[PDB]
């Protein structure tokens, strides 16, 4: 299993970028994918999420519909198009898989899965500045 992010860099405000998440070592048609960013000096913050088929795309309110996240079964990768970049958007971005590998507490006998982000890529840095 391996996730690699690419496509980040320096951009002026108001531009449009594309972040690519390449997945390997696991079947890509069964795990929903999420994008989570972290600003330097701060904690993690959710950005976007998509199911396996991509028909259910959800975004945090702070991004409205400015970002567009999609996935394709052909190339087995995730992509995120970025529009209307702002000063508070510069961050390191990770793409993660929502896998039920997590087993919380003694509920293992009751067979209850806590869907978590088990595999995190190394992330790519997007710096929005002049």
């Amino acid at each position: 299993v391996q996730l690699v992010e690419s496509g980040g860099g320096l951009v002026q405000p108001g531009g449009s970028l594309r972040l690519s998440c390449a997945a390997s070592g696991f079947i890509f048609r069964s795990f929903s994918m999420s994008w989570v960013r972290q600003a330097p000096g701060k904690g993690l913050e959710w950005v976007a999420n998509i199911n396996e088929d991509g028909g259910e795309k959800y975004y945090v309110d702070s991004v409205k519909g400015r970002f567009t996240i999609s996935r394709d079964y052909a190339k087995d990768s995730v992509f995120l198009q970025m529009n209307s970049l702002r000063a508070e958007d510069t961050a390191v971005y990770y793409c993660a898989r929502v896998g039920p590998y997590y087993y919380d507490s003694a509920g293992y006998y009751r067979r209850h899965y806590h869907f978590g982000m088990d595999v995190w890529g190394q992330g790519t840095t997007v710096t929005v500045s002049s």
């Binding site: 993690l44 913050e45 999420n49 990770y94 997590y102 507490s105 982000m117 088990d118």
Partner: protein
């Protein structure tokens, strides 16, 4: 519905330390060291109503990190403020 976490918790080596996360059935915990991506999570988890708790037994030097609690329910995930654990 942002979660609530203590700013920082400190304790002696080898001591069991509890970290609380107050906000709901799906809750996950992640550990993150500086310079590395967060990793999904001696560690015992528990839940009670709107509160979750993670207890660490046998604290060591390598356990210095920041721990985050998330609530992946439906299709929207919310992260907490982040608890930076301190190892004496």
């Amino acid at each position: 519905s942002a979660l609530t976490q203590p700013a920082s918790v400190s304790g002696s080596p080898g001591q069991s330390i509890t970290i609380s996360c107050t906000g709901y059935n799906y809750v996950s915990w992640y550990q993150q060291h500086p310079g590395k991506a967060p990793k999904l999570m001696r560690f015992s988890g528990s839940k009670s109503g709107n509160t979750a708790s993670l207890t660490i037994s046998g604290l060591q030097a390598e356990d210095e990190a920041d721990y985050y609690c998330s609530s992946y329910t439906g299709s929207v995930t919310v992260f907490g403020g982040g608890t930076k654990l301190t190892v004496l």
